[PDB]
Amino acid sequence: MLKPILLVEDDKRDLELTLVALERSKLSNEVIVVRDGAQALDYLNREGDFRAREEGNPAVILLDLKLPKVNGLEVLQQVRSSTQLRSIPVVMLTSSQEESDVVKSYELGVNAYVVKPVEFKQFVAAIADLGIFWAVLNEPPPGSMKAMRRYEAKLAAALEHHHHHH
Amino acid sequence: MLKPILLVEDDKRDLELTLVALERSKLSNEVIVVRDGAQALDYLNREGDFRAREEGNPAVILLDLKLPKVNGLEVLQQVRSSTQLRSIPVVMLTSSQEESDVVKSYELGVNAYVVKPVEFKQFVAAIADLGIFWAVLNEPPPGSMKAMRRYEAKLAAALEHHHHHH
Ligand SMILES: C[As](C)(=O)[O-]
Ligand SMILES: C[As](C)(=O)[O-]
Ligand SMILES: [Mg+2]
Ligand SMILES: [Mg+2]
Ligand SMILES: [Zn+2]
Ligand SMILES: [Zn+2]
Ligand SMILES: [Zn+2]
Ligand SMILES: [Zn+2]
Ligand SMILES: [Zn+2]
Ligand SMILES: [Zn+2]
């Protein structure tokens, strides 16, 4: 029932901050992390590594502009040009308020902005800015928890350090 | 999957403000309204008008202290004394900050407070104060929408006026 959140972010230090903000916020849609724009487009179009996934758009895309191989703006344009994808809400993760302002000038109907580094308060404020629907839960869905934990571990192994213990 | 929110509130003018804040916030758990503490306890215990309802606790109780017949504090004590009910998060709707402070002194583990009149911003801040889990949705669940619309209509017919049109 709950659709995933697609987090598109290469820089592993930034990924850490964004996932921690997500964990802290208790936002419970399953996170799916891809690390460049080619992988994001594969996820969204169900190709590549994602060829076998269930049909359906993510609830939200958290889209870093800084992506190797295929830039974040190319992902955003292909999303908004697609009749299938164009309805997906997007939070752009930018480097400065000036960058957010420039992106607004492209008129790609970006729904919200977070200026990096991502912190919990600004992050939740961006999600609130989307003006989409939401619901409270007593229990997180177990697949969501498993996914966050799995990424925390992969990211820890890759960065060769951890910040907390569960 | 999503559990309802139980709104316990007699005064019809206050009910209007609380439902509008809920509608505006796009919080999408189904609302269930009861108008005094006797009805609230019947809902929670599946008795009375609610004898046939599905098993399960509401996600949140929005509990007005001012209730005819059975007071809101008696509902809160019976909830916290019950091994079945005591885990339910409660937002108390109070008349002043002094009232919130007094209620905190009872040590009934009240999770959040809204000082009436309820407005959208303070309302969402109270829900955030609960520190519970939540999820975003593109579509509200249709049963939720039907329920809000149904109450708006009953409340309009009872107050003999409306404030907006859908
Ligand atoms: C040494 As330890 C608390 O990271 O298992
Ligand atoms: C007169 As009318 C806009 O309440 O149907
Ligand atoms: Mg980047
Ligand atoms: Mg009252
Ligand atoms: Zn350690
Ligand atoms: Zn680190
Ligand atoms: Zn963690
Ligand atoms: Zn009218
Ligand atoms: Zn009115
Ligand atoms: Zn309405």
A16 is annotated as contributing to ligand binding: yes
DSSP-derived secondary structure for chain B: -PPPEEEE---HHHHHHHHHHHHHHTB-SPEEEE-SHHHHHHHHHT-GGGTTSPS---SEEEEES--SSS-HHHHHHHHHH-TTTTTS-EEEEESSHHHHHHHHTTT----EEEESSP-HHHHHHHHHHT--EEEEESS--HHHHHHHHHHHHHHHHHHT--S---
Q: Does B138 touch chain A (CB under 8 A)?
A: yes
Q: Give the torsion sign (CA, B131, A28, A93, A118).
A: positive
Q: Does A125 touch chain B (CB under 8 A)?
A: no
d(CA A145, CA B52): 34
Residue from the list B87, B124, B134 with its beta carbon closest to the beta carbon of A137? B134
Q: CA Rg, chain B, in Å?
A: 15
B16 is annotated as contributing to ligand binding: yes
Q: Per DSSP, what are the bridge partners of residue A114?
A: A93
d(CA A139, CA A119): 24
Furthest-apart CA atoms within chain B: distance in Å: 43
Residue from the list A28, A59, A127 with its beta carbon closest to the beta carbon of B138? A59
Residue A41, H or E segment = helix A37-45
Q: Which amino acid is at B119?
A: E
B91 CA: distance to closest CA in chain A (Å): 13
| Given resolution (angstroms) | 1.9
Chain B residue whose CA is closest to A127: B136
CB-based contacts of A53, cutoff 8 Å, min separation 6: A43, A46
- Let me know: does A45 contact A57? Beta carbons within 8 Å: no
Residue A25, H or E segment = helix A12-25
Backbone angles phi, psi at B136, to 5 degrees: -90, 150
Mutation target vs A (from B136, B138, B145, B148; most A CBs, 10 A cutoff): B136
Which string of b and e fits B116-155 if b means at least 16 CB within 10 Å?
Answer: bebbeeebbebbeebebbbbbbeebbeebbebbeebbeeb
- Let me know: does B119 contact B17? Beta carbons within 8 Å: yes
Burial of B36 (0-12, 13-18, 19+ CB in 10 A): buried
Q: How was this structure determined?
A: X-ray
d(CA A91, CA A43): 17
3-state secondary structure of A145: helix
Nearest to A140 by CA among A16, A23, A39, A37: A23
Check whether the bond before B58 is cis (ω within 30° of 0): no
Backbone angles phi, psi at A81, to 5 degrees: -80, -15
The full set of domains in chain B, from first to last, is 1-166 (3.40.50.2300)
